[PDB]
Design a protein around this ligand. Structure first.
Ligand SMILES: [Cl-]
Ligand SMILES: [Cl-]
Ligand SMILES: [Cl-]
Lengths: 203, 203
């Protein structure tokens, strides 16, 4: 009886500027901060047993805002980090087609196998998220787990938990300022909530 | 750019008694009516141009309550009907195990191939929902479609739209009193919301 409460970090400056966000630092905007504050209200009644957060500061900043009233052991997991884009970090799609046309166009036509320049390909990234899924049995005695991460990770986590290939991650888009939930009972994952802005209740 | 707003009908007396509820009539309770009235408040700002509904009066009753203010002709689609349970309609699992032991035991163990007594099996039920997916192109010029149906249909619809086998329908459970949304862009289906109790806004 394990419920994973999925949370994507708030809106960042890189989102407003339409840049690639990977391991590079970018701060939460004023709206992204208030999104995490509203989530603190919407999940105030949930008694989490553990917080799982990415190494990136914008994720940890969100986790702190959702748990302002409270105090709870937070665990920092590098497998929850967004895909590493290498030389493409904090750069726009229009500029990459002119400054790195050869590699970037191959990425646009076959993102599953083309590797971003000096970055992390999709195969290695999906293996890293798969490593986190195999690691969830370590938390078998926690009932409610809060997971603060990024859209590429959370969409892939949903896809693989309920048995789809990694390439099907884009059938699920998780949004900022919302929360999602997935239940795992006897290694069977059930998507219960996806992108809710309502008050969450334990069950 | 098609968005299907999915709504399962509210709580019924059959739900209160824990009975198999398929094609047999069963009324909304006072709570099930209140669920549809709250959904009317949640979706007040969504400009539906079409409402798809099953033949069951309890689903049409829900659609009328969700759209009390608006005027919008309800299209009655028998493919959106719940699975037909035949002689098992409006009966309890505790009683069916004794009175129809051989057939009901087979259904509990091989539910994807065993036929409910004088009912419709899961193969014919999945083909029927598949038939509904095939004629979705008839609604290509509508943008916000309200789909009022039942849990078996809506779970199977989501699973098949994003490319999963019919038997994976139980990785998604559509709850009562909530709304879900799936977007279809160039024959690619995206699950955007699953069982929300928050205010909905159209894309
Ligand atoms: Cl950051
Ligand atoms: Cl029902
Ligand atoms: Cl009815």
């Amino acid at each position: 009886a394990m419920r994973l409460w999925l949370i994507r970090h708030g809106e960042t400056q890189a989102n407003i500027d339409g840049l690639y966000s990977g391991h590079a630092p970018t701060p939460l905007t004023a709206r992204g901060i208030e999104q995490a504050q509203n989530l603190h209200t919407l999940l105030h009644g949930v008694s989490f047993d553990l917080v799982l957060c990415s190494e990136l500061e914008r994720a940890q900043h969100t986790a702190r805002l959702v748990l302002s009233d409270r105090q709870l052991p937070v665990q920092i997991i590098p497998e929850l980090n967004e895909m590493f884009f290498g030389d493409w970090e904090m750069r726009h799609h229009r500029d990459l087609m002119q400054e790195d046309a050869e590699n970037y166009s191959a990425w646009c036509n076959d993102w599953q196998h083309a590797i971003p320049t000096n970055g992390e390909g999709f195969q290695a990234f999906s293996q890293r998220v798969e490593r986190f899924i195999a690691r969830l049995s370590e938390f078998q005695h926690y009932q409610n787990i809060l997971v603060v991460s990024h859209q590429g990770v959370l969409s892939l986590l949903i896809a693989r938990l309920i048995g789809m290939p990694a390439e099907a991650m884009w059938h699920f888009r998780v949004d900022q300022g919302c929360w999602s939930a997935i239940d795992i009972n006897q290694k069977f994952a059930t998507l219960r909530v996806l992108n809710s802005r309502a008050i969450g209740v334990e069950n």
